[PDB]
Amino acid sequence: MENFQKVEKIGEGTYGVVYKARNKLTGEVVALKKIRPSTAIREISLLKELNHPNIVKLLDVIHTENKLYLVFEFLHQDLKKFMDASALTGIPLPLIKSYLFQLLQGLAFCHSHRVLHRDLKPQNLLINTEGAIKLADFGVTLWYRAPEILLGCKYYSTAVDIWSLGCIFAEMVTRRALFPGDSEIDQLFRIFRTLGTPDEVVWPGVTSMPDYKPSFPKWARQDFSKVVPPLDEDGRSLLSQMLHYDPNKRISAKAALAHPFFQDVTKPVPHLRL
Ligand SMILES: CC(=O)Nc1c[nH]nc1C(=O)Nc1ccc(F)cc1
């Protein structure tokens, strides 16, 4: 702190509190996160170089008085608050599609540098007046969690981010969370009831996962047409590939960018009341 005046609390993150603050030198308005190892130090410092138009810029890491503060580019609103704000008519599809396309771009970036987010969720997704959307708060909600994580895979891949983003995608379209678990088992079982209990056909190796049980109930898959009306056939094809059980079949961000759903992408501006 010190060289930064807290203007307000804007969140109580996973790894600490987030403040809007103003730099007493630069004059600059930033987002200041107070965290709470040399290893936390080295991976954090790797973040400072992961720079992309769809990634919140990490301005500075202050390791001082034996505390950790992260200084971030300030954005004025997150996608959760924009969703609650837009619930009556919903986010216009060209806006949903621009948002998805840019997040795919951020993820294409991170993933090509072997960085996973691990915890995407509408609250970590930040928006500006210019129509941009950025990824923040890189890795108690269970809702956007990939099923390989829920099944206890320890060495899971970039495909987890693709799964979270498809859940966010579906949520923007229907104005309700795709899979609102309130426990890990409820989360897993909600995924199962919509998509089918997975098996060796759709996901080789699933019955050998650590937390998999033969006693899991055996639900049938519902059809996507019922899951996210009124997403068009392109949107639905893409969403279906983002939600493949097998993380190895699940579409990449780079491949998803080439999907015909984006043939007509544009960059609308949202109407944001700050
Ligand atoms: C976690 C993190 O890095 N957050 C941020 C970085 N820049 N801006 C933020 C942030 O949380 N901005 C908001 C401002 C106002 C809101 F209502 C919500 C988010």
| The CATH number of domain 77-272, selected from 2.70.98.30, 1.10.510.10, 3.30.1600.10, 1.10.101.10 | 1.10.510.10
Ligand 1 center from residue 151 Cα (angstroms): 31
Buried b (16+ CB within 10 A) or exposed e, 252-271: bbeebbebebbeeeeeeebe
The yes-or-no answer on residue 232 being catalytic is: no
* 3-state secondary structure labels for all residues of 151-211: CCCCCCCCHHHHHHHHHHHHHHHHCCCCCCCCCHHHHHHHHHHHHCCCCCCCCCCHHHCCC
| Maximum alpha-carbon separation in the chain | 61
Phi, psi dihedral angles at 193 (to 5 degrees): -70, -25
CATH of the structural domain 1-76, one choice from 3.20.20.70, 3.40.1550.10, 3.30.360.10, 3.30.200.20: 3.30.200.20
CA proximity to 137, closest of 117, 122, 157: 117
**Residue 273 phi/psi, 5° resolution?**
-95, 110
Spacing, Cα 81 to ligand 1 middle (Å): 11
d(CA 128, CA 112): 25
Say if residues 80 and 172 touch (Cβ distance below 8 Å).
no
C-alpha dihedral, 199 to 204 to 210 to 213, nearest 10°: 20
Experimental technique of record: X-ray
Residue bearing the CA closest to ligand 1, atom 7? 74
Binding residues for ATP are 10-18, 33, 73-75, 78, 121-124, 137
Helix axes 233-242, 159-174, angle to 10 degrees: 140
State the Cα–Cα distance between residues 274 and 267, nearest whole angstrom: 20
Q: Report the amino acid identity of residue 115.
A: V
Query: Is the CB of residue 72 below 6 angstroms from any atom belonging to ligand 1?
Result: yes
Q: Tell me the best of 54, 126, 273 to mutate to test the pocket of ligand 1, counting ligand atoms within 8 Å of each CB and taking the most.
A: 126
Q: Is any ligand 1 atom within 6 A of the Cβ of residue 148? A: no
Alpha carbons 152 and 257: distance in angstroms, whole number? 29
- The structure was resolved to a resolution in Å of 2.2
Domain locations along the chain: 1-76, 77-272
The number of the ligand 1 atom at minimal distance from the alpha carbon of 81 is 17
* CB-ligand 1 contact for 137 (6 Å cutoff): yes
Q: How far does residue 64's CA lie from ligand 1's centre (Å)?
A: 22
Tell me, in angstroms, the distance from the centre of ligand 1 to residue 11's CA: 8
Ligand 1 pocket residue status of 193, Cβ below 6 Å: no
CA 102/CA 253 separation, integer angstroms: 10
Q: Is the CB of 120 under 6 A from ligand 1?
A: no
Number of helices and strands in the chain (H, E): 9, 8
